[PDB]
């Protein structure tokens, strides 16, 4: 549809779920994939295998738009970051760089009950 020929793949690796979004350099999201769209529900949504499947699915459905090379930045500290990145790079798109951009507060808002008691 667009055929930018060079975009970027965002990997939102939360604890409960992993989300993969591929987009142009302009930030316009062409498409996305998740553990949920594969069909996995509940606990197994954030499993490394689900991350692998989500990465492959996103890559496959992105190949239709003619994407060949991406520059990935990973977000979140979920269990399946490494699995997702390896699957994505071993899907058929030549990744230039692999980067993390996990958002960390500068001691801002007061977190949830469970996430408190910071050292």
């Amino acid at each position: 549809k667009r055929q930018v020929a060079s975009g970027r793949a965002y990997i939102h690796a939360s604890y409960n779920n992993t989300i993969v979004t591929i987009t142009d350099p302009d930030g316009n999201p062409i498409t996305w994939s998740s553990g949920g769209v594969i069909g996995y529900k509940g606990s197994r949504k954030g499993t490394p295998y689900a991350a692998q499947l989500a990465a492959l699915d996103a890559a496959k459905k992105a190949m239709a738009y003619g994407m060949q090379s991406v520059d990935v930045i990973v977000r979140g500290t979920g269990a399946g970051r490494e699995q997702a990145i390896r699957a994505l790079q071993a899907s058929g798109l030549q990744v230039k760089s692999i980067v993390d951009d996990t958002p960390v507060p500068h001691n801002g808002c007061r977190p949830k009950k469970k996430f408190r008691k910071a050292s």
Binding site: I73, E82, I85, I98, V99, D100, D101, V104
Partner: protein
């Protein structure tokens, strides 16, 4: 190898000596601890003050992104 080792002669209160200041920041725009810098606390404290001041001036990054998986 401590960051101090791979350096010569400089001033710490000089909040404009930007080129040496990039040295004391990590792969991410974080101030390296005393284990990495290789300074005494007084030096570490004054350097941290200077680093924050330069950050306010916009000469230095508050944070960056790291090229790794």
């Amino acid at each position: 190898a401590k960051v101090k080792a791979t350096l010569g002669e400089f001033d710490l209160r000089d909040y404009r000596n930007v080129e040496v200041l990039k040295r004391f920041l990590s792969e991410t725009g974080k101030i390296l601890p005393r284990r990495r810098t290789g300074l005494s606390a007084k030096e570490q404290r004054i350097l941290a003050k200077t680093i924050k001041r330069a950050r306010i001036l916009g000469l230095l990054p508050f944070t960056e992104k790291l090229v790794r998986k």
